[PDB]
Amino acid sequence: MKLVIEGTIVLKTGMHIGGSSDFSAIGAVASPVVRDTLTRLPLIPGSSLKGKMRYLLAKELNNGILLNEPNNDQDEILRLFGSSEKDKIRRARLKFNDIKLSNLAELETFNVSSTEVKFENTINRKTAVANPRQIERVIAGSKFDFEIFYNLDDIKEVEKDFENIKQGFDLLEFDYLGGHGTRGSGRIAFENLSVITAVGNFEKINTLNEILGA
Amino acid sequence: MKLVIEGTIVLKTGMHIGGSSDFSAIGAVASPVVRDTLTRLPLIPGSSLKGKMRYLLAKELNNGILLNEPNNDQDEILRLFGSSEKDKIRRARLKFNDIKLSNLAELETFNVSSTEVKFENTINRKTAVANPRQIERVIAGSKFDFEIFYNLDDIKEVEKDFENIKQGFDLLEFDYLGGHGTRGSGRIAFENLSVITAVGNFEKINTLNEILGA
Amino acid sequence: MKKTYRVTLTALGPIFIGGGEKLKKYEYIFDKQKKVAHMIDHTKFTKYLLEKNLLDDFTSRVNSHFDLYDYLVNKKGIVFMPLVKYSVPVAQFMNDLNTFVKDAFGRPYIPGSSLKGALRTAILNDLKEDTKENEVFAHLQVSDSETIDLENLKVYQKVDYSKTAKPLPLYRECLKPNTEITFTVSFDDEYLTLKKIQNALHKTYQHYYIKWLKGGKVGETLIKGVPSQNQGEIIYIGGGAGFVSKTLHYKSKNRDQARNDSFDILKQLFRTTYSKMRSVPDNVPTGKHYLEMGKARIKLEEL
Amino acid sequence: IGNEKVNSTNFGDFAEKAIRGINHKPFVQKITTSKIRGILELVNKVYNRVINTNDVELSENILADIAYIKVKIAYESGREPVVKDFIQRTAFTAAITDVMNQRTRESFLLFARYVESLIAYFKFY
Amino acid sequence: TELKIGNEKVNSTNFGDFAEKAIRGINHKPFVNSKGGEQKITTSKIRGILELVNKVYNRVINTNDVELSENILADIAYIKVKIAYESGREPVVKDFIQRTAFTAAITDVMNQRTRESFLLFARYVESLIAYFKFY
Amino acid sequence: TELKIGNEKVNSTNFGDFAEKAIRGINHKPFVNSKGGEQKITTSKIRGILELVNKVYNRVINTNDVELSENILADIAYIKVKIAYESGREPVVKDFIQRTAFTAAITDVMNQRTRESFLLFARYVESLIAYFKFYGGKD
RNA sequence: AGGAGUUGAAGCUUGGUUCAAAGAACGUAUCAAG
């Protein structure tokens, strides 16, 4: 069986992610936000979510600090997010996806664009001359309905895997998702969290949905 | 293991912050205030609070003078706010957030709007002909409920770091927050300070509210 | 090192900051014949009129422009008056009121930009070369005041005193005198101090006296008068205090600066120029004081 | 978004046409740059409170504001004949009465942009 | 693709050269300020014009449709009004707009209500200020 | 197939050599910023120039016709605008752009509006960045 | 009895930093060799 980890990511702050691949004007945004280029709808890359979740979860596990490569995590993190060390290679149980902006109609209901420009500057400490920059940034309260595929390979380890997954989401609630996070952006939260089967049925599906629905 | 520094910023004076992309009418306000663009209700950027706190800490630490680049501050400042020097990048233990207005209901009790247009000019001292302007300025007595995620790294420095954080909370009482603050704006008051754990339980957390919320 | 000082601005004369709110002959103003004025709020006035004969009372008063003088309040049984934000006294000896700047709570205060403009006018009595990158005014931290009570406001008649006093149809809502206004000012000692501020204010006031206003008090002068140097810690806050109060160029002689600004203001405008300017007092009653306008007293205190 | 023949787009063009109609064959003493600014200041004093509101309809106090600036410009028209010719050759009171019978925020922003364009194109010529 | 100025056309391979010729027309024969003195336009006025355009540019390059919306073109009309007003402010701004023919370009954008016409106009304004700062 | 810079033409036999000569002429005579000391352009600005070239280079290499399309030439003209803007800002950028002659190259790309001319320009700028990192790198 | 005139002016429009790292680089079967 494979399981699908359905949910949504709601933004409490800006969450500027990414770099185009677009030309810039000389009075407009530098470093614009990354977009799904067919629809020009803002996007969370699955690589960003996977990397931040992996870093936070392998910071909590390995209690304290981590200073090593991704191949030197414990077997929970290696079995959850893949590995590439030379002989003890482990296929990733989790498959993330590119997350498009999902509630565009409810953003347009309040009569505003899907993104914003946030004006910044920096002052030189000796000459007090400012240096403005403009960053494109997604507006707060933007929801991102995501889904993550889980590969049910060992039925006696799925309890610890979903415990670790809920641990990683609960850590990522108290941290930014990408870009200028320490300077007041990126703070997200996780809602509508559930797990469903791909095809068939998993026997203890309720013990996974309860460990994520709290 | 993170700590969350819940608090409330109380406005004593105007605090005009930010650049908007609003088109400005010519008999109206020019350079309006920054807003949380979903509802576009008034906003304190996290970057502004971080910039002022890093400035006022980097004056009091290294007592007095300041003419150096921001990566060359003291060790407390770099370990509290972050670094970008090539050899020693410090991941910031602080994480500021955009602070939206909270007491709009308290303001609708007083039946006033959440902001105000302040009339200024400039007298050219040669011929005494004026040069007017309007600035959009948030009203005094407006609260801003914020929460800053302290990322705990090692317990040997958490006491010194919250002592420096309360020092920077104290230092911003006597200086402005943003905008035309040398001319009577931006006077803040940090009221009802507190700290709490995200998950788990810090055993010496009763000492931290003593050195911070006092 | 951020020398914070508590500034108590004693309003020695009428202080006026304005703030962009003009009150017309009968437009929110309610002036009665007991020498006080009341003023109303636009929302409660308009709904109090729209609750009773909407188009009727609008077309009646719009027909009665411009002669209103708030006796439609008496004749129409609208003597019921909950429309009192605050009451203000009037000093007379036809109406267009300018009111004091108030914050969002409708309770007045002097903004800190006003006081910085006053101290900048006082400090800049060197040569007029100090542009928008002078380092001495980037290190002066002046805040606003606490909310002054609404009973310290008084409506005055703007009188001009060149040869003999005659009134001008302009009322501005000033402060009554000897009223204490409290500021909190801080600065870096590397650029200016207490001594520089007191010396600049003393120098500005003494040149203001001996170059124009002592000349007012002895030249083109008669017995219509019926104050220097006292300490002297006196500055002029922008209550229509005059052209020579707002400018700086009575540096550094009596003559060439007088003919310079004589040409400069009263050549390009309509009236004919030569010595000298006109003085603006205010007045209160039966004997009169002719107390002069815009002046105030400044005190500096350690913390 | 109709609002009496002048869209969200052609407001500045109508104001330019009106001011060019003013500039050749004027009234008798042409209008100065202070009364028209007073009209601008009162309407943009209403505009600040309007544009910082949240919703797409208007409150009771806002309808009070447009009603009272109607009686204010009635008073100011009652002062001088040149401003009577100004407000007559403009559809100003027509726009105010359409704001009364329409009560939509976008119509108020369109009227505010129209009177701003009146100020701008009076200044341009 | 197409944007007319007079009887002389500027298109999207070409706006840099007319920005050259426009600024080099502002230089070598500058404004006279009803005096014998010389006067050229300041940085802040033209770049306030740039920020006036870039309040619209950030909502056009972000979008998809080949025809401009009514909100966007309403703000384009607002740009034309603000051009007229800040022309009325200062005579040096008036001759900068008249020589570097900006009203012609903004009226071209208001006539052909396409996305790429406004984007070409934004290219032309950015190139105008680029060749202002280069000299 | 042969791009003109000054009085000597550069083609796909010399652009590495021309860019090497240009970079090694930037050293041994650097730029002075109207103060006492010299100042050369940093890594980040020339990586900005290379990113500006690469924003078109990522699209041109997957094109069909030997003559460039109009949106490619639009972006090439806008690169010329951007380089002229950033050089007028800082005089250290103007010195690097004039000495390692960039504007003449991009104009003569715009004249002969062919694919091979733009590829010659792009490999020229790539070699220019390469030799700047090769000589006196600060990594 | 209030008239006019300034409705914003100037400056900076991003600065610096890493700019593809580690893996696999064909494996087998006939052919051949025994």
A117 and chain E: CB distance < 8 Å anywhere?
Answer: yes
Contacts of A65 by beta carbon, 8 Å cutoff, 6+ apart:
A59, B153
Q: What is the full DSSP assignment across A73-109?
A: S-HHHHHHH----SSS----SEE---EE---HHHHHT
Sign, CA dihedral A59-A62-A65-A67, equals negative
Token pair 């050749």 is found at D24
Q: Which 8-state DSSP code applies to residue F67?
A: B
The token pair at C263 is 């040409």
Contacts of C130 by beta carbon, 8 Å cutoff, 6+ apart:
C124, C136, C137
The token pair at A37 is 């280029």
Contacts of A143 by beta carbon, 8 Å cutoff, 6+ apart:
A8, A9, A10, A11, A101, A102, A103, A106, A191
Chains F and E touch (3+ CB pairs under 8 A): yes
Residue C228, CB, strand G, below 7 Å? no
Pairing of strands A99-100, A41-44: antiparallel
Residue A133, CB, strand G, below 7 Å? yes
> Mutate which of C4, C103, C249, C257 to test chain B, going by most B C-beta atoms within 10 A?
C103
Residues forming a β-bridge with B42: B35
Nearest residue to B100 via CA among B145, B138, B140: B145
Q: Are A120 and A133 in contact (CB under 8 A)?
A: yes
The token pair at B67 is 């003419």
* Other beta carbons less than 10 A from residue A121's beta carbon: 14
Specify the DSSP element, H or E, that contains C301. strand C295-302
The token pair at C115 is 């006081």
Question: Are A26 and E129 in contact (CB < 8 Å)?
Answer: yes
C58 and chain D: CB distance < 8 Å anywhere?
Answer: yes
Q: Angle CA(D95)–CA(D99)–CA(D105) in degrees, nearest 5? A: 120
Distance CA(C62)–CA(D75), nearest Å, equals 7
Distance CA(C160)–CA(C5), nearest Å, equals 36
Nearest residue to D76 via CA among D44, D32, D45, D23: D32
From chain E, pick out residues whose CB is under 8 angstroms from the CB of B20.
none
C93 and chain D: CB distance < 8 Å anywhere?
Answer: no
From chain F, pick out residues whose CB is under 8 angstroms from the CB of A22.
55
Chains C and E touch (3+ CB pairs under 8 A): no
Question: Are E13 and F77 in contact (CB < 8 Å)?
Answer: yes
DSSP E strands in B53-162: the ranges are 99-100, 115-120, 133-138, 143-151
Segment F129-137 long-range contacts (CB within 8 Å, at least 24 positions apart): F129/F46, F129/F47, F129/F49, F129/F50, F130/F19, F131/F16, F131/F19, F131/F20, F131/F23, F131/F24, F132/F23, F132/F26, F132/F46, F133/F43, F134/F23, F135/F23, F135/F24, F135/F27, F136/F27
Instruction: Report the nucleotide nearest the CA of residue F92, measured to C1'.
Output: G15
Pairing of strands C295-302, C5-11: antiparallel
3-state class (DSSP) for residue C272: coil
Instruction: Report the nucleotide nearest the CA of residue A27, measured to C1'.
Output: G13
Closest partner residue to D121 among E76, E77, E84, by Cβ?
E84
Q: Are B2 and B190 in contact (CB under 8 A)?
A: no
Alpha helices in chain B (DSSP H): 46-60, 75-81, 104-110, 158-171, 206-212
How far, rounded to the nearest angstrom, does the alpha carbon of residue A57 sit from its chain's CA centroid? 13
The token pair at B172 is 């911003």
Peptide bond into C154 cis (omega under 30): no
B104 and chain C: CB distance < 8 Å anywhere?
Answer: no
| Cβ-based contacts under 8 A for chains B and D | 29
Q: Chain B residue with minimal CA distance to E79?
A: B23
The residue whose CA lies nearest the C1' of nucleotide G14 is: A133
Residue D32, CB, strand G, below 7 Å? yes
Q: Are D46 and D62 in contact (CB under 8 A)?
A: yes
Question: Are D119 and B114 in contact (CB < 8 Å)?
Answer: no
Q: What is the full DSSP assignment across C171-206?
A: EEEEE-SSEEEEEEEEE-TTT--HHHHHHHHHHHHH
Nearest residue to B157 via CA among B146, B168, B165, B148: B165
Q: What is the Cβ-side half-sphere exposure of residue B7, based on CA atoms within 13 angstroms?
A: 24
The token pair at A162 is 């979903």
Strand ranges across the sheet with C234-236: C140-142, C179-187, C5-11, C295-302, C234-236
The residue whose CA lies nearest the C1' of nucleotide G21 is: A69
From chain C, pick out residues whose CB is under 8 angstroms from the CB of B112.
104-105
Q: Are B121 and B132 in contact (CB under 8 A)?
A: yes
Q: Are E116 and E12 in contact (CB under 8 A)?
A: yes
- Number of domains composing chain A: 1
Burial of residue F69, with CB atoms counted within 10 A of its CB: 0-12 exposed, 13-18 middle, 19 or more buried? middle
Distance CA(C39)–CA(E93), nearest Å, equals 44
Number of H helices, E strands in chain C: 8, 12
Query: What's the one-letter identity of residue D36?
Result: I
Distance CA(A17)–CA(A49), nearest Å, equals 11
DSSP E strands in chain A: the ranges are 2-11, 35-36, 41-44, 94-95, 99-100, 115-123, 130-138, 143-151, 188-197
Q: What is the full DSSP assignment across E106-127?
A: HHHHHHS-BHHHHHHHHHHHHH
Print burial letters for B22-44: b (CB count within 10 Å at least 16), e (below 16).
Answer: bbbbbbbbebbbbbbbbbbebbb
Give how far F80 is from chain E: nearest CA, Å: 8
Question: Are F82 and A21 in contact (CB < 8 Å)?
Answer: no
Residue E86, CB, strand G, below 7 Å? yes
The token pair at D44 is 């943009």
Q: Are E19 and E13 in contact (CB under 8 A)?
A: no
Question: Are E134 and F87 in contact (CB < 8 Å)?
Answer: yes
Distance CA(A119)–CA(A142), nearest Å, equals 20
How far, rounded to the nearest angstrom, does the alpha carbon of residue C254 sit from its chain's CA centroid? 26
The token pair at B13 is 């004076």
**How far is CA C282 from each of CA C10, C34, C154, E30, rounded to the nearest angstrom?**
17, 20, 11, 51
Contacts of B88 by beta carbon, 8 Å cutoff, 6+ apart:
none
Distance CA(A76)–CA(A66), nearest Å, equals 15
For chain E, positions 27-56, list CB contacts with chain D under 8 A.
none
Residue F42, CB, strand G, below 7 Å? yes
SS3 for chain D is CCCCCCCCCCHHHHHHHHHHHHHCCCCCCCCCCCHHHHHHHHHHHHHHHHHCCCCCECCHHHHHHHHHHHHHHHHHHHHCHHHHHHHHHCCHHHHHHHHHHHCEHHHHHHHHHHHHHHHHHHHHC
From chain A, pick out residues whose CB is under 8 angstroms from the CB of B50.
182-184
The residue whose CA lies nearest the C1' of nucleotide G8 is: B133
Contacts of C91 by beta carbon, 8 Å cutoff, 6+ apart:
C154, C155, C156, C157, C282, C283, C284, C285
Q: Which 8-state DSSP code applies to residue B86?
A: S
The token pair at D61 is 């106090």
Give how far B175 is from chain D: nearest CA, Å: 28
Distance CA(D75)–CA(D78), nearest Å, equals 5
Q: Angle CA(B184)–CA(C301)–CA(C112) in degrees, nearest 5? A: 15
Distance CA(B130)–CA(F61), nearest Å, equals 59
Q: Are E50 and A27 in contact (CB under 8 A)?
A: yes
Q: Chain D residue with minimal CA distance to E94?
A: D124
Most distant CA pair in chain A, distance:
68
Token pair 């520094």 is found at B5
Distance CA(C267)–CA(C277), nearest Å, equals 13
Q: What is the Cβ-side half-sphere exposure of residue C128, based on CA atoms within 13 angstroms?
A: 13
Q: What are phi and psi of A46, to 5 degrees?
A: -70, -25
Give how far C138 is from chain D: nearest CA, Å: 31
Q: Are C121 and B125 in contact (CB under 8 A)?
A: yes
Which positions on strand G lie below 7 Å from a protein C-beta? 1-19, 22-23
| Cβ-based contacts under 8 A for chains B and E | 7
Question: Are D116 and B27 in contact (CB < 8 Å)?
Answer: yes
Nearest residue to C27 via CA among D87, D76, D63: D76
Sign, CA dihedral D109-D115-D119-D122, equals positive
Residues 20-39 of A with CB under 7 A from strand G: 24-28, 30-31
Nearest residue to B82 via CA among B72, B74, B69, B93: B93
The token pair at A184 is 């007041």
Query: What's the one-letter identity of residue C35?
Result: K
Question: Are D8 and E74 in contact (CB < 8 Å)?
Answer: yes
Separation of F76 CA and G18 C1' (Å): 28
Closest partner residue to F84 among E15, E123, E131, by Cβ?
E131
Question: Are E55 and B26 in contact (CB < 8 Å)?
Answer: no
Domain range spanning residue B211?
1-214
Q: Are D40 and D119 in contact (CB under 8 A)?
A: yes
Nearest residue to D87 via CA among D125, D28, D36: D36
Q: Are D76 and D43 in contact (CB under 8 A)?
A: no
Q: Are A42 and A115 in contact (CB under 8 A)?
A: yes
Q: Which 8-state DSSP code applies to residue C23?
A: E
Q: What is the Cβ-side half-sphere exposure of residue A170, based on CA atoms within 13 angstroms?
A: 17
Q: Angle CA(C142)–CA(C145)–CA(C149) in degrees, nearest 5? A: 170
The token pair at F100 is 């390692």
* Other beta carbons less than 10 A from residue E4's beta carbon: 16
**Resolution given for this structure, in angstroms:** 3.0
Peptide bond into B134 cis (omega under 30): no
Distance CA(A18)–CA(A44), nearest Å, equals 9
Question: Are A39 and E58 in contact (CB < 8 Å)?
Answer: no
Contacts of B201 by beta carbon, 8 Å cutoff, 6+ apart:
none
How far, rounded to the nearest angstrom, does the alpha carbon of residue F114 sit from its chain's CA centroid? 17
